[PDB]
Design a protein around this ligand. Structure first.
Ligand SMILES: COc1cccc(-c2cccc(CC[C@]3(C)CC(=O)N(C)C(N)=N3)c2)c1
Ligand SMILES: COc1cccc(-c2cccc(CC[C@]3(C)CC(=O)N(C)C(N)=N3)c2)c1
Lengths: 374, 374
């Protein structure tokens, strides 16, 4: 797996991507690693933001499926043509598979102007595949057609990172891996059973933490929290960090907040602990994230010249989202074979000589199933 | 006001815009009419999507305010330089004012590729102005510096439309105007006190309809409803329209729905009535919207060749949003002088020889203040 170490580039701001090849002969593309979707979708026309695009005409092995997809998002859409071709990951397992590929022919507010990737690797399950659950996702194909074991792991750094296809690499984490069940195979849905801020639980019904969903999503930047839990969550961190003062707009992601080089004090800000359903009845474990995770460098502002961070927590109609900023603290194992997700302390998380990112257990938590929304 | 009739172009899909001139000599720009924000912000560099941009160097009257703004949104941002200059609306009142202008120098996922406007006319109040409430919005300046009465009205058609600055035009509506109080002058916040689907109330706590906000917003396409009310809302329309069947993804705005020319039956779909707090204690009125409003032509799809509409209702962490698709049924009067918003049936709404858009009252509704979130 030394092969696959450091095979990712990018950042929580713009996404993490892996190099892939598609078609015969191989056309190289940079492709967003997205555990929050299930389509393998690549730019296939000369949109001006794009460095590279898939040229089906140049591939002997391409096969048209004579079917189109139209894919709207909150504020983004794409449209494309469905087909299959031969797909490989240079710095992945040494195999080549025939995968579905959506050739993206039209899009709005999808590709990022200035980014270095040209497609999306949707790594979630068939259920949320577009247009329907009969379009086999890349990873299912990879598992079906080769002997690659049914799991992958992500270490997102932005301290790029590593995607280990088919296994786990011990160099990427410290301590022990703790596993939460995948509640259902659609998104990478999990159950948060308790939340503490600094060391004190919001003491709210845990069903709220997972209303209607909680998911792990390498293609969302932030920790996203339901309206009702975002209210409470911010209420507590806001009050936790009453040393200094910050505007109302900041907490709603409406303006950035700034300090000078070094003058950002993490320590006004509390660590955050999410307790996840464990593998055993009445057993949980917890993951603890630092302020460095929830306050992210907004790299360039010419209208300022300060350490200006954005508050990396936000609200949602669609549930908890554990995003890149949460994942950056951890080695995360998507153990599809066993319907579970493993978390360990990332060997590349950013830590002072004070606090740290932590994965701890067992804890005793009763009635954890009741925390899920049906 | 015949002057100002038909002074808008666009559609709920891409926005409605009015022609403005800025600087001396006049530089003409098309500018989004946005009752959901409070900044006058114009493209001021050659972003390639843009037809036109503000060139401050060409204006004798421009004045730099030596201050920058950085303005993040859910998925869009812009950055610009603050200044003032002389602003006019060719097909508006014959005046010219000195307004704040944010010269947009950098942006992502803000401007629309293929659109015909280059800036935003933020018509809401100082409270939500960026960077703070001391940046005087265009409309406050217009009222301060001229004798233009403190109100405007919008007729959004997309059957373009009309913005009447300083008054009301009787040709744009039928029947009577009914007024709901502006609960607070930040957004154009209102209070929905009851909701019926086809003719039956969701029977849920009205405080939910306005959690945390309800607003009128010409720069949002959809009717947006809180998570909890969106659930119930869809539950009822879904069941209302059980003649035919549509996928789960459709209702969540995840895929479009299609029929052939003429084969879309509105009549499987129920009319929707929102009851708004009235001007008098225990008095309300109601606005009734057709399926034509909540199911919007998604104009071009090459992956299909059918009447493919998108479901124009969606959920929100930030409240009810009465958007362009709601406003298209009505003449809407933003009567800032009297802290109220008037609704009447639009003389340009689209109606069969069956149902219609309606504004009706009085109704007796007790405890309407309790419907607002504090
Ligand atoms: C860390 O990942 C990032 C950061 C910033 C932007 C993106 C990004 C940009 C364009 C497209 C996508 C993919 C979007 C989607 C297919 C649908 C969606 O709403 N989400 C959140 C996911 N996960 N995948 C991501 C990813
Ligand atoms: C009908 O209006 C539309 C339709 C489609 C897109 C827009 C649009 C495109 C780009 C920018 C904006 C302005 C956004 C904002 C300043 C912030 C925001 O989130 N909203 C909803 C509002 N109202 N104004 C609109 C407007």
């Amino acid at each position: 797996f030394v092969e696959m170490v450091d095979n990712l580039r990018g950042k929580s701001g713009q996404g993490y991507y892996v190099e892939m090849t598609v078609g015969s002969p191989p056309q190289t593309l940079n492709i967003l690693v997205d555990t929050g979707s299930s389509n393998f979708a690549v730019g296939a026309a000369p949109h001006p933001f794009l460095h590279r695009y898939y040229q089906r005409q140049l591939s002997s092995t391409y096969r048209d499926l004579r079917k189109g997809v139209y894919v709207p998002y909150t504020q983004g859409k794409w449209e494309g043509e469905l087909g299959t071709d031969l797909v490989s990951i240079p710095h992945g397992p040494n195999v080549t598979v025939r995968a579905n590929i959506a050739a993206i022919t039209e899009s709005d507010k999808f590709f990022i102007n200035g980014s270095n990737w040209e497609g999306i690797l949707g790594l979630a399950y068939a259920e949320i595949a577009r247009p329907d659950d009969s379009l086999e996702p890349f990873f299912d194909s990879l598992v079906k057609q080769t002997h690659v074991p049914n799991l992958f792991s992500l270490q997102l750094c932005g301290a790029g990172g590593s995607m280990i296809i088919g296994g786990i690499d011990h160099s990427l984490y410290t301590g022990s891996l703790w596993y939460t069940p995948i509640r259902r195979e659609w998104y990478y849905e999990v159950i948060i059973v308790r939340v503490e801020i600094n060391g004190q639980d919001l003491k709210m019904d845990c069903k709220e933490y997972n209303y209607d969903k909680s998911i792990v999503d390498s293609g969302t930047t932030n920790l996203r929290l339901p309206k009702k839990v975002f209210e409470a969550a911010v209420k507590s961190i806001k009050a936790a960090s009453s040393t200094e003062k910050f505007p109302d707009g900041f907490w709603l992601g409406e303006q950035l907040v700034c300090w000078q080089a070094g003058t950002t004090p993490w320590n006004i800000f509390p660590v955050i602990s999410l307790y996840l359903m464990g593998e055993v009845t009445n057993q949980s474990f917890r993951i603890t994230i630092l302020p460095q995770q929830y306050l992210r460098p907004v790299e360039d502002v010419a209208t300022s010249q300060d350490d200006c961070y954005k508050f990396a927590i936000s609200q949602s109609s669609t549930g908890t989202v554990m995003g890149a900023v949460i994942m950056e603290g951890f080695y995360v194992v998507f153990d599809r074979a066993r319907k579970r997700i493993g978390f360990a302390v990332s060997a590349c998380h950013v830590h002072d000589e004070f606090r740290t990112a932590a994965v701890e257990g067992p804890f005793v938590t009763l009635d954890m199933e009741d925390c899920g929304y049906n």
